[PDB]
Amino acid sequence: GRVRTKTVKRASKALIERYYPKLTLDFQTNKRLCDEIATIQSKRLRNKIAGYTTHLMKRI
Amino acid sequence: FSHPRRYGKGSRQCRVCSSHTGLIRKYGLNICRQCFREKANDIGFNKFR
Amino acid sequence: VLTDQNPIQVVVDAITNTGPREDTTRVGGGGAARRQAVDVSPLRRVNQAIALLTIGAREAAFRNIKTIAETLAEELINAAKGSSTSYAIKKKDELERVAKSNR
Amino acid sequence: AVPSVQTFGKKKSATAVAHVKAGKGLIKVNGSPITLVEPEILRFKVYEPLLLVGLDKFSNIDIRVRVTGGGHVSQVYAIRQAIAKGLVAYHQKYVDEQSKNELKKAFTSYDRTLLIADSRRPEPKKFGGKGARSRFQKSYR
Amino acid sequence: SLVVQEQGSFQHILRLLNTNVDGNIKIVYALTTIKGVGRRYSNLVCKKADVDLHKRAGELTQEELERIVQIMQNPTHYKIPAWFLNRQNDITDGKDYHTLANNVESKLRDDLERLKKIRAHRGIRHFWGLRVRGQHTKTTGRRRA
Amino acid sequence: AQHAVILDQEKYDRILKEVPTYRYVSVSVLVDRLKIGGSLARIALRHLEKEGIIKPISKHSKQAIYTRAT
Amino acid sequence: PGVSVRDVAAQDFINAYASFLQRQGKLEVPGYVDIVKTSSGNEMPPQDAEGWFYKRAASVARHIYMRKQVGVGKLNKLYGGAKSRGVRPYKHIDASGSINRKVLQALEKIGIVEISPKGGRRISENGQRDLDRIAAQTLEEDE
Amino acid sequence: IRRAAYGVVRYVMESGAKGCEVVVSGKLRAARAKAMKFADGFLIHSGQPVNDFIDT
Amino acid sequence: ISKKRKLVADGVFYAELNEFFTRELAEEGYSGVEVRVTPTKTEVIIRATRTQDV
Amino acid sequence: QQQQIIKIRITLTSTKVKQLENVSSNIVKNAEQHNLVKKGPVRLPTKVLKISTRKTPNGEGSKTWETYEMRIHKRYIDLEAPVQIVKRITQITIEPGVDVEVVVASN
Amino acid sequence: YRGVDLEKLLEMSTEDFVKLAPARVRRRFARGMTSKPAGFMKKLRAAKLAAPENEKPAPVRTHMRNMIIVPEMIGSVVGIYNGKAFNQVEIRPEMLGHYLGEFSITYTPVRHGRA
RNA sequence: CUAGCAUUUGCUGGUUAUCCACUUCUUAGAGGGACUAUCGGUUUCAAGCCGAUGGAAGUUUGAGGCAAUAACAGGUCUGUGAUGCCCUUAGACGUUCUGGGCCGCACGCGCGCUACACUGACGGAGCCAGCGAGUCUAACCUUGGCCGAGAGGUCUUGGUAAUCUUGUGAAACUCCGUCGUGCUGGGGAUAGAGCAUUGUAAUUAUUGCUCUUCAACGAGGAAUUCCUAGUAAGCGCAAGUCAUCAGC
Ligand SMILES: [Zn+2]
């Protein structure tokens, strides 16, 4: 199934704490933000992070 | 003290260890399959998939 | 040629007629197994209908002069009419009768 | 120069490179008509591009297809969509969009699903069987 | 091309080279009941006899039948190549032959008896009822019949 | 079932009488109903087609389907 | 219109352009005819018998038209099917080398084909005429 | 062994090393053979990073 | 010689060298080797700890 | 004699993509700096040398296989240049593990 | 042997015999004979010449199971090595064109059951 | 530029740098793209899951590779100049040459190939892949021509390879013919004779080819294996081994 690991769910919570001002309820802009503010090595993980970040922003 | 050795397993031996069995000839290696897996990455054969 | 009807309709009628409504499942409770009567889902009816038709037609064509096209046509026409000559109808009625016996 | 589009299609390893032009109205295959498709049944699957849309749009367009790779039934399906993408890529540039959407509407609403490549590629055979999923027979006793 | 034939003309059973041949079968296949005649040989003989390959064996005239028998017996005379014959360069005479009918069972026996008399490995294996062509006998040929 | 090997006048006359009555005509139909050869049956169909007694619906190398000429 | 070999079906072309060559009877039949079976991996020889070599030349004509410059080896491979090895599994075996060579010589004597440079047999100018002529004839024949 | 192994492990771990391991296997005075391990610090085991970082 | 054969043979050249120095420069503390193929020359670099008495 | 413009094919072969791209880029950049006629780096299909062995040195265990790959990356650059400039370009770009062949085009 | 009567076979050259022989025999002679066959032929000739009238010649031992029987050998006694013994066989006319090895079995028949 | 069909410019092909212009198809180098996106259901309205629509793709996107702590008296001393101890060491258990053997057949078990036919066999015709590999001082992949029923032979040529072999015109399959339910034209075992090929050597048939011989087997008892999408199964091809030999 699609269940997200710790590193996804952890780093999503860690971003939202610092930048609930900034960020939206839209994936496309979030992923491009996550490049600047966070230093991610991978490209696939960045898209996972930003996807769950959007799921949490929808709940807020 | 010698006989035909032009073709066959008697002719071809391993560079390293002098075994006739289980040779790899492909690309002119002439390394026995066991010795190949030892010296695979050294040569430049790396696993990927 | 044999029915003067839209042969697509004949295929549909054959499938509707040959689909078993009740079936038996094997239920067992620690060693011993009985047959229990159960209802059959519409998707399963269609699947069994098609299977029975194509198996019947294939067995009828095996080591016979008649071609698979002819035996399939015969099987479909007989099934559309609800004829007890059809392999598919015989097997449907057998299954439903066995279901009724294990209710 | 005359208008030109260099569309293509594919199923599996087939790659049917079409060329559409401002033409008289020829719908060619390799260098032969649409009646030159020896798959007797799969005549009608390379027909569908020009059948289910409108005859009239096929009266002023030179379509001709150069099919390479693949196998007999993959050739059919590669050509098909290279035709059905050819007119749509033509109607993109040199025809109205409201017309060009009725091409895509009439195609996609038939349960055609031309799409592009039906993305199903072969799953590799891996050691220990003759197939990808299938394994050699185990003995036990 | 339905063309009705008189019931007297058709021969249900033909006797050729001491063997019974079924007239109901097409000539090319009918002739394969004769030991030494295979499908390719039969076809060639019919083509050299100028007999139609589509005819049934019971529709053969006696003249066509005699011509077939002559071509079968003396194939070299009708320009059949040596390489097509079943016994090339016979060990006794050096001549090419096409053994037929009963001769086959005899010539076979003769070839063996020769090998037995010579005491060649192949002859000895034939004497013991063992496979001669280097086959592995550990697993294969376990029921006689 | 017995199957014909030679044409035969009585069988020829039966082919001409019976085959136009049949709604569906194929190689098997002749074999079953007319105790005929499978390959006599193919010749018969080609003859009856030439005479215009039966109409071809579909001609495939392995299966020929005919109807009566209504 | 400007008819070609390609504009006609490949089956009906071979049936017609065979019936062209056997009727006039200018083609050089090899002499083997009744003997040979046309491949190593064939079981029996052809059923047509009175013909077949005409059908082969009718194929090789049509084939050499469309391709650039074919040879015997490519023709061997084309016609040669899968040999039953009895009990072993099947494999592709390339067809009879002589009989395809005799067809290439036979069509050269009529002048349907000629010897190309860079190897192989290209279609000739008289060839194109003859094939396009029967192509236009065969199109107008059937209706 | 233990002096030698702990000796080398500590020499690695001092000079910049994020982790280390030493396995010694075989006969050592007793007849039956045994495999002692002398791990220290942090090291990953799986994936492409093995090829990148860790030196076997 | 082909490129498929040549690069493989340079691989076996490295591999022969690595194994040669390993047992030859045992006491002298051999780390490894790298080779740089130029047009004229062929450079080699024996990396080692005990670089004094090598 | 030196000023005669010669058509030359530089062929680059390597197992290591990064080095081979660096060398290829440097040759193209140097050709631009000297205003030479260049046909750019044509990337040939990568040859994948594949060897499949049994993992086990003996008969035992499940029949598991290992597949080793060596990838050979090949590129060529066509240049029209005088002999003097060509010798300069080739000498500057010698990187370890990149093989460099120079072929003079004679028709 | 293939028409040619035995008197004529004994007079015939090895080369002419080879023309009449099967494909395998022909191919072997076409590839040439080494020095070892020639030495054996010399010994057979010497043994046949030294034999009394109406006695069989002294048996010549050989390991060459691959040697082909040639007309010249007729009437000679050859000890053919089987792997442990040299078996003695007189080259009869019917053995022409066969290998020496065919007349010397390498294995003992397999007898099951019986102790 | 040039050939044919046809007059309507055409339509269909040769001439791979006579040439120009593009990079859609092809190659591979950077980057992008997917995150269950967006919406509707259903639950600790959590993780999630299910439906629908877009999308190249929504079964961890499909497939692998790498793979913890540990263990086993698992296998390997017949891969190793990895190795302890023991045995042996000139009439050798070192090594090398000749020949044989590993294949030997009342039989029991395992993996397989070919079959039992009409959805098929046979004959003509149509005619489409992908992954591969390939010789400089070595005999490698082989085109084209010529000889041959075929296997092959033979004269030259391209290729150290996206170039030449090779569009590997593969097989099943596709069409039109031929058979007609019979161990039949299904099935091709066993066996005889001959002709090639590799090799110092083919006998205990290396292998291929031609004719002939034409067995069991009419869907497989108790049992039991593999398998959920380009998958199962059918189907052939290259590679490994390889002088030659594939049912692997
Ligand atoms: Zn080794």
Side-chain angles (χ1 to χ4, degrees):
Chain A
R2 319 302 178 105
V3 185
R4 283 159 280 277
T5 189
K6 60 189 75 174
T7 59
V8 172
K9 295 173 168 276
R10 189 114 68 67
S12 294
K13 291 163 64 176
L15 260 64
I16 292 161
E17 283 174 1
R18 321 306 164 65
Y19 306 90
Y20 180 50
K22 215 170 291 180
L23 293 167
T24 63
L25 53 79
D26 159 68
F27 169 70
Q28 304 298 146
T29 190
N30 298 358
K31 110 187 94 73
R32 294 273 87 180
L33 191 73
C34 298
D35 292 296
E36 288 286 359
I37 64 97
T39 300
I40 313 171
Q41 292 288 354
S42 176
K43 210 283 290 294
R44 206 173 101 82
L45 184 58
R46 183 237 291 169
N47 305 313
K48 283 178 171 292
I49 280 160
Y52 192 52
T53 308
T54 306
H55 193 225
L56 294 172
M57 287 271 179
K58 193 181 305 309
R59 292 184 65 194
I60 292 162
Chain B
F1 209 79
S2 273
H3 158 263
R5 217 166 295 261
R6 286 185 279 289
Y7 61 84
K9 296 197 165 181
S11 65
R12 291 164 287 99
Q13 70 190 15
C14 179
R15 291 165 167 286
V16 188
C17 71
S18 182
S19 78
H20 305 292
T21 293
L23 261 173
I24 317 180
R25 278 144 56 59
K26 201 182 216 267
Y27 318 123
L29 263 86
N30 311 125
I31 291 165
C32 73
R33 63 193 196 91
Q34 293 93 17
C35 289
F36 177 68
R37 298 203 336 115
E38 293 193 356
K39 321 212 94 71
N41 289 21
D42 300 4
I43 288 164
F45 282 95
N46 312 301
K47 185 139 195 48
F48 294 91
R49 58 170 290 199
Chain C
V1 172
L2 289 172
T3 61
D4 301 315
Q5 286 172 46
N6 186 337
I8 305 180
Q9 185 59 47
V10 176
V11 168
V12 167
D13 284 354
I15 290 168
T16 59
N17 290 342
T18 54
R21 295 165 171 177
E22 293 191 341
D23 196 358
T24 60
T25 188
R26 188 176 183 234
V27 185
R34 63 178 188 280
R35 296 293 180 172
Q36 182 60 56
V38 294
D39 303 308
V40 181
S41 66
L43 184 58
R44 189 166 180 262
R45 283 191 280 144
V46 172
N47 287 328
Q48 285 185 319
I50 294 168
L52 287 172
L53 291 164
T54 55
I55 290 163
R58 183 178 295 121
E59 290 181 357
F62 187 70
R63 303 176 184 169
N64 197 347
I65 299 155
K66 294 193 181 186
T67 68
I68 189 58
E70 293 156 351
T71 61
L72 185 60
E74 283 170 19
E75 191 63 18
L76 287 164
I77 294 161
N78 289 319
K81 293 182 195 292
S83 179
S84 63
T85 59
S86 161
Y87 177 84
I89 296 292
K90 287 175 192 178
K91 284 290 161 198
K92 179 225 178 176
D93 298 346
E94 187 179 359
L95 287 169
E96 290 183 358
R97 184 182 65 73
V98 167
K100 189 174 180 179
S101 305
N102 295 291
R103 198 178 207 125
Chain D
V2 298
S4 297
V5 289
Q6 305 184 71
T7 57
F8 63 96
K10 35 194 79 185
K11 165 176 284 286
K12 300 183 182 171
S13 196
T15 57
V17 179
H19 286 93
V20 191
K21 299 171 65 177
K24 190 160 67 76
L26 67 95
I27 306 169
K28 229 71 182 291
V29 186
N30 299 114
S32 320
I34 195 156
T35 54
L36 276 267
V37 171
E38 283 81 58
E40 291 289 298
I41 273 52
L42 305 180
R43 191 74 63 69
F44 309 106
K45 289 319 214 62
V46 72
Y47 274 164
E48 277 173 29
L50 77 102
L51 310 205
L52 184 54
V53 56
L55 272 162
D56 299 299
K57 286 169 281 291
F58 294 79
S59 300
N60 53 77
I61 39 167
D62 284 357
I63 308 169
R64 63 98 175 291
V65 188
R66 290 179 60 261
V67 200
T68 58
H72 288 329
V73 179
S74 79
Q75 302 294 62
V76 160
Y77 280 83
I79 300 150
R80 154 197 266 230
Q81 73 182 245
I83 299 167
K85 287 170 60 182
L87 81 162
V88 172
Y90 183 72
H91 286 39
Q92 168 62 17
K93 292 186 73 176
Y94 310 106
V95 184
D96 191 15
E97 288 284 304
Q98 192 170 64
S99 187
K100 172 266 183 178
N101 289 10
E102 293 174 5
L103 278 47
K104 295 176 72 72
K105 186 175 180 179
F107 284 149
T108 308
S109 71
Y110 155 80
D111 289 47
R112 220 326 91 240
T113 68
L114 293 155
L115 300 160
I116 51 150
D118 195 65
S119 171
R120 294 192 288 183
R121 288 282 163 291
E123 184 177 342
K125 151 160 159 49
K126 319 129 191 73
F127 55 84
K130 267 167 65 178
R133 299 299 177 67
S134 68
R135 318 309 306 152
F136 297 130
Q137 181 147 290
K138 175 169 281 177
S139 318
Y140 282 127
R141 291 182 186 175
Chain E
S1 303
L2 294 161
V3 176
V4 176
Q5 305 178 11
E6 296 182 0
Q7 296 184 357
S9 60
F10 188 82
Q11 297 190 10
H12 287 278
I13 305 171
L14 304 108
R15 194 170 186 132
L16 277 163
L17 295 169
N18 302 311
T19 60
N20 296 340
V21 177
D22 181 8
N24 302 306
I25 310 174
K26 290 187 172 199
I27 296 161
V28 178
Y29 300 99
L31 294 172
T32 67
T33 61
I34 311 180
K35 202 174 195 170
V37 178
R39 295 181 208 162
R40 190 147 99 120
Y41 192 81
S42 178
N43 191 318
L44 185 65
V45 168
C46 298
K47 287 182 169 178
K48 289 293 186 172
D50 302 311
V51 174
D52 172 37
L53 283 70
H54 300 303
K55 284 179 179 187
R56 294 185 180 252
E59 305 173 350
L60 277 161
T61 60
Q62 187 167 4
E63 294 178 1
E64 287 167 320
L65 190 153
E66 286 175 11
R67 282 185 290 147
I68 287 165
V69 170
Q70 290 175 3
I71 296 161
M72 283 187 175
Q73 288 179 349
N74 329 105
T76 51
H77 294 262
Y78 298 95
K79 307 183 176 182
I80 299 177
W83 62 258
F84 196 93
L85 308 178
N86 68 16
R87 188 170 190 122
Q88 294 158 31
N89 297 318
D90 196 7
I91 300 158
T92 59
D93 311 344
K95 293 180 184 175
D96 300 316
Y97 300 108
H98 187 92
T99 66
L100 284 180
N102 295 296
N103 206 9
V104 177
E105 304 81 302
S106 323
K107 289 266 61 172
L108 180 49
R109 187 229 71 166
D110 300 1
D111 284 303
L112 305 181
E113 285 186 15
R114 187 182 60 96
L115 291 168
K116 290 170 184 178
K117 277 147 75 167
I118 288 168
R119 304 192 193 232
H121 175 261
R122 292 177 57 196
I124 298 173
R125 291 282 286 222
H126 279 294
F127 179 75
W128 292 335
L130 298 181
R131 284 149 175 234
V132 180
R133 293 181 194 220
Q135 297 161 358
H136 299 270
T137 51
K138 185 172 176 174
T139 52
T140 73
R142 279 195 182 176
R143 287 175 187 130
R144 275 269 198 183
Chain F
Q2 298 178 4
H3 291 325
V5 283
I6 319 152
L7 180 56
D8 308 350
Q9 191 59 42
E10 297 182 2
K11 299 196 183 88
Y12 180 76
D13 299 335
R14 277 180 280 183
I15 291 160
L16 292 173
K17 308 316 190 193
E18 291 189 16
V19 177
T21 73
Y22 298 138
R23 184 170 169 182
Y24 172 74
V25 173
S26 74
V27 178
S28 60
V29 173
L30 298 181
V31 172
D32 293 317
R33 305 173 181 231
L34 281 175
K35 305 304 161 300
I36 200 199
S39 46
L40 292 182
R42 291 189 204 114
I43 296 167
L45 291 172
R46 290 172 182 181
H47 196 264
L48 292 170
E49 173 171 37
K50 284 172 178 188
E51 294 179 308
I53 297 170
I54 61 177
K55 289 179 173 175
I57 314 172
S58 183
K59 292 183 181 181
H60 187 261
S61 59
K62 299 183 182 179
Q63 192 168 15
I65 300 170
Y66 299 92
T67 39
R68 64 184 189 183
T70 48
Chain G
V3 178
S4 62
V5 302
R6 292 180 166 104
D7 299 18
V8 190
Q11 195 193 2
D12 298 359
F13 183 101
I14 267 74
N15 291 14
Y17 181 67
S19 192
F20 180 53
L21 290 160
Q22 63 170 0
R23 278 188 294 84
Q24 67 178 51
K26 192 176 175 68
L27 191 75
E28 184 181 64
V29 298
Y32 317 139
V33 179
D34 48 2
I35 301 156
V36 70
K37 56 170 175 176
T38 76
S39 190
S40 177
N42 266 82
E43 189 166 2
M44 285 188 69
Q47 293 199 52
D48 181 52
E50 295 94 302
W52 84 252
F53 191 95
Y54 293 92
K55 301 284 271 282
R56 181 58 59 103
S59 175
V60 174
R62 177 156 194 295
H63 192 85
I64 289 165
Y65 189 101
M66 297 190 290
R67 284 75 182 179
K68 295 165 61 268
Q69 40 173 359
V70 329
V72 178
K74 276 72 181 290
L75 291 162
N76 294 352
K77 195 172 197 175
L78 179 65
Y79 300 109
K83 177 162 192 73
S84 177
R85 314 224 308 293
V87 91
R88 277 105 65 192
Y90 294 76
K91 72 197 287 277
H92 152 87
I93 294 185
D94 61 304
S96 54
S98 284
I99 99 90
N100 297 308
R101 206 198 311 111
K102 297 303 92 169
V103 166
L104 279 179
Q105 293 180 72
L107 289 164
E108 198 186 307
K109 292 289 140 285
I110 299 176
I112 305 297
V113 75
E114 57 169 300
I115 299 162
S116 190
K118 314 296 190 295
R121 260 75 165 231
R122 68 161 65 116
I123 199 77
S124 187
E125 76 288 302
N126 191 244
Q128 290 190 174
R129 165 54 197 168
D130 291 10
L131 285 329
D132 287 41
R133 174 266 195 179
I134 191 63
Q137 192 179 119
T138 305
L139 212 185
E140 295 283 70
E141 185 176 61
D142 61 67
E143 291 185 358
Chain H
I1 178 163
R2 277 177 157 123
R3 173 159 60 177
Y6 286 128
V8 70
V9 169
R10 284 283 173 188
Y11 181 32
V12 166
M13 281 295 308
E14 190 65 63
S15 48
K18 167 163 282 289
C20 191
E21 199 167 72
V22 176
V23 190
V24 174
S25 310
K27 283 170 73 183
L28 210 47
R29 218 147 186 163
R32 187 81 93 115
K34 188 165 56 271
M36 284 197 69
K37 189 177 291 171
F38 301 91
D40 199 294
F42 176 97
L43 53 93
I44 62 99
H45 286 104
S46 73
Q48 171 65 49
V50 174
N51 298 342
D52 295 309
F53 303 125
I54 87 94
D55 185 12
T56 314
Chain I
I1 308 95
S2 184
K3 300 296 140 200
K4 298 172 84 170
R5 183 159 289 187
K6 199 181 67 60
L7 296 181
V8 166
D10 282 53
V12 171
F13 171 45
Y14 176 96
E16 168 76 86
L17 268 171
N18 191 12
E19 213 280 345
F20 170 52
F21 293 140
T22 293
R23 59 180 65 233
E24 181 54 286
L25 297 312
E27 301 293 348
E28 291 80 59
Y30 168 86
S31 173
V33 64
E34 56 181 63
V35 295
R36 313 196 291 231
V37 180
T38 60
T40 55
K41 294 181 289 184
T42 52
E43 301 283 65
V44 187
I45 307 93
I46 302 164
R47 301 195 310 293
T49 57
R50 197 82 68 70
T51 317
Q52 191 72 63
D53 69 73
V54 72
Chain J
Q1 289 186 354
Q2 293 181 357
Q3 294 184 354
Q4 190 168 46
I5 300 167
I6 311 189
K7 300 179 74 149
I8 295 171
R9 177 161 292 166
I10 305 177
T11 299
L12 306 173
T13 310
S14 185
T15 54
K16 308 181 184 174
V17 178
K18 292 184 180 179
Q19 288 86 339
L20 188 69
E21 284 292 347
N22 291 350
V23 168
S24 183
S25 184
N26 290 343
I27 293 168
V28 171
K29 185 178 165 185
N30 288 318
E32 283 172 352
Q33 187 174 352
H34 296 298
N35 293 116
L36 295 173
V37 182
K38 66 187 195 292
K39 294 177 173 177
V42 182
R43 298 192 171 76
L44 291 169
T46 295
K47 294 183 196 170
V48 183
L49 306 182
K50 179 177 163 163
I51 299 178
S52 295
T53 53
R54 202 186 180 195
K55 285 191 175 191
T56 46
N58 73 2
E60 192 81 353
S62 293
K63 298 156 190 176
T64 57
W65 296 81
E66 197 151 343
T67 293
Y68 301 92
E69 293 184 0
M70 178 180 287
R71 298 183 178 184
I72 302 173
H73 306 274
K74 199 173 182 171
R75 301 188 182 110
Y76 71 88
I77 304 166
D78 298 339
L79 295 173
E80 309 193 355
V83 174
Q84 290 294 339
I85 301 176
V86 176
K87 289 179 177 179
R88 198 170 191 172
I89 291 169
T90 57
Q91 287 173 0
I92 291 164
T93 56
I94 304 165
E95 185 138 6
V98 180
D99 180 45
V100 184
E101 300 184 309
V102 183
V103 178
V104 174
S106 307
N107 277 348
Chain K
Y1 188 95
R2 315 194 186 256
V4 182
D5 300 312
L6 197 64
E7 293 180 359
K8 189 166 176 177
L9 287 167
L10 289 167
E11 297 171 1
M12 273 175 77
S13 75
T14 299
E15 295 179 3
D16 298 312
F17 170 71
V18 163
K19 294 167 189 164
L20 300 176
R24 289 308 317 222
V25 176
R26 279 184 282 152
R27 176 162 183 156
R28 198 192 172 200
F29 281 93
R31 290 280 168 188
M33 293 162 65
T34 54
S35 187
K36 283 186 178 183
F40 172 66
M41 292 302 290
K42 188 177 178 178
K43 287 180 181 189
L44 290 176
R45 278 184 274 178
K48 190 171 175 172
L49 185 63
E53 293 181 1
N54 306 301
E55 287 194 9
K56 296 183 182 182
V60 180
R61 292 179 178 183
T62 188
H63 283 87
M64 295 187 291
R65 299 186 74 228
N66 63 339
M67 190 59 182
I68 289 160
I69 299 175
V70 178
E72 192 177 356
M73 300 184 178
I74 296 164
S76 305
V77 182
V78 182
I80 307 170
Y81 194 63
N82 72 345
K84 64 171 296 177
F86 306 82
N87 311 47
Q88 320 275 53
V89 189
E90 191 194 3
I91 303 298
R92 303 185 296 192
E94 304 84 1
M95 305 185 172
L96 288 169
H98 293 268
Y99 291 101
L100 285 185
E102 295 170 50
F103 303 101
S104 189
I105 308 177
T106 52
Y107 60 94
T108 84
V110 168
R111 287 163 292 123
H112 291 318
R114 193 168 84 165

